[PDB]
Design a protein around this ligand. Sequence first.
Ligand SMILES: Nc1ncnc2c1ncn2[C@@H]1O[C@H](COP(=O)(O)O)[C@@H](O)[C@H]1OP(=O)(O)O
Length: 142
Amino acid sequence: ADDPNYFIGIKFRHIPYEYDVKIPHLTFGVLFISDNMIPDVVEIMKIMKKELFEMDITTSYTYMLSDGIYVANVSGVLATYFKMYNLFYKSQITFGQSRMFIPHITLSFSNNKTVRIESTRLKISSIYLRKIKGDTVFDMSE
Ligand SMILES: Nc1ncnc2c1ncn2[C@@H]1O[C@H](COP(=O)(O)O)[C@@H](O)[C@H]1OP(=O)(O)O
């Protein structure tokens, strides 16, 4: 569906930028799932963990994703994204949207223009599964 109720998200110890947003995270997939499907989604989340923490994430610049969306790019994440995409799909879990996935960290919800830095590596602090406009049901730390 394109009305997801849950999403997987990633949180980093520090951001090499400045942000208005109350919570800085990397969205890593959105889901349309029923609570009786919470365990299965957790297992895959458990299964992907090693690669998720062996992932080399980096930022080089910031940009406007869309009108009034100011974000920072992230790279090194797409392969493990599609790997997990396959795992969800094969368990018949609705994961994905019609629109293509772009990995980003939302920095602000206002119009600002690009900043740059040397390639810098993001260190994951947490990976979680959370309901949309809702509580976090599951958390994983390294
Ligand atoms: N590929 C994309 N292209 C344009 N906008 C996107 C894209 N992916 C996400 N967004 C929008 O940027 C916002 C960043 O939110 P997040 O904290 O989850 O990263 C999303 O709410 C989304 O707003 P929208 O769904 O209205 O298009």
